[PDB]
Amino acid sequence: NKMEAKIDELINNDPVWSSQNESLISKPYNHILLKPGKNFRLNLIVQINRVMNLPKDQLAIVSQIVELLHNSSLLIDDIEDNAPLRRGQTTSHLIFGVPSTINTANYMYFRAMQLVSQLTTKEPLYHNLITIFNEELINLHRGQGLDIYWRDFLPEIIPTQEMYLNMVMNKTGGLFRLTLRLMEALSPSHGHSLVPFINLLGIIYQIRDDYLNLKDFQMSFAEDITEGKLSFPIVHALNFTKTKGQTEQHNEILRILLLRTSDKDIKLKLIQILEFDTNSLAYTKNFINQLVNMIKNDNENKYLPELLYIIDHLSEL
């Protein structure tokens, strides 16, 4: 009778959720907020609004959405890559546990989704916005999915340079495109689609990330090696040795990646294979320079609409 009352009261109302609960579930996410870089992301949005000109109000929601997805994908990525550190501080899963961190990351994907219906009340443009959201999140997952698959099934498949570019288009292009596409759809104005340029951007960004992880270490943790990642320099190297018939160095690269080693001496050995044998770091520094020139020597603004500036500090988005 009193129990039935309380039950009937419970089931006739919306599920209870307090802000103390919100705070609990938010701890793993809030922890990654301490990580810097929010400005270089924001700067890229700002700079881009000069072409799209979204009403400051609207630009902020787009910004919050982007932040949520970006930070959430990183929380997940660190669990998937078993990373002990991010932007120098301890990763969330190591503090709040893998359980809570996955759940919080996933919760924020859907919170981000909710922020979408607040960009416009126009029913047709709403659909477009959700579709854009849906599609790019699907691409991000396909790309991350292949990145993980090749790493975890090695040495079953060894990606070619081209397979890798297709992976990055999905993986790193997803959020770049998502941000750009939302803005172009909300633009009250602006010229050619700036997507090809945001694509080139994502690509440059990922190779440089793959590059600097090995270079910073050479000149002085190179986690990518410990992770066993088919990064750009590695794909080059594996394909070079197979092509040049260098069986030993090929297998030697495979063996080090498969060790999932934290050993600095072994780490160096692979980098030395990469400098002296396949010259892959040099090859990669070059490849990036050319992608960058495709935007620098863009006189007929085929890709272009300050961008030179972002492109150089791109490593901190």
Added chain:
Amino acid sequence: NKMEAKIDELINNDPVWSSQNESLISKPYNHILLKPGKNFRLNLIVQINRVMNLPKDQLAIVSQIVELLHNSSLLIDDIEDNAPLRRGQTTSHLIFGVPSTINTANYMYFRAMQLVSQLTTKEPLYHNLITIFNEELINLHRGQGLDIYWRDFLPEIIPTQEMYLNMVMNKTGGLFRLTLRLMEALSPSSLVPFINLLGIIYQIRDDYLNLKDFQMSKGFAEDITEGKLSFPIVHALNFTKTKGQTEQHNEILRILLLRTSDKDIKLKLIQILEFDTNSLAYTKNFINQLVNMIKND
């Protein structure tokens, strides 16, 4: 040039994705499809439809949506719960790894969202359906978030019965209400409260049999191994606190925090609930009262 030309063809096209790739990343999910239960969910979708009168085309798409959401939920939940088995089979994360399983499950959440647009060509309705989809998935994660937090940080928070039921309304109620609300919005013809009570009965009976089955044989009482704040455990913990059974309250916590698979230790915990806190009898009677709230409707 050839490189610049190749970079140019790439950036001016949609990302390349093949059925081979699709295939490779669906491995974790295809594995869980083997497991049963799929027909009762359809049976439940079907029964409710005797009321909702949805055309069979649309009913099929709601089923597909719900199955994808549920199975993905299970893939993740087993990672979160460190579960070795599901429906008597090895969990995907132990076969394909935690990384691919987390990615594929999340991938499938978005494939499900993508299917919502196959339900209508009418914008006003579309918007409602997406909102429902969005709202319940937010509820589901809030629920899951408390269940995981209370457990992984025990004894930081000792939930009360009222708190457990709020968690369950979000967590279990989330998928029940998702199906029903989408069906109710597609009806050319609410049962929300009833679906909420069905969810709660569902959850408490599930918690209860996990322990009872093992006390009797039949089951592994894996909830103890997980350290879960189940309905019988929540009753025992508040009963002990309130009745001043310090040692017992503490032994319950200690056993939960062992994450043990020792049968005698789990049996000792269960017998504490049976003879000391009488949490089992209590859960049984509570389940019965709730079942009466329907059968007596």
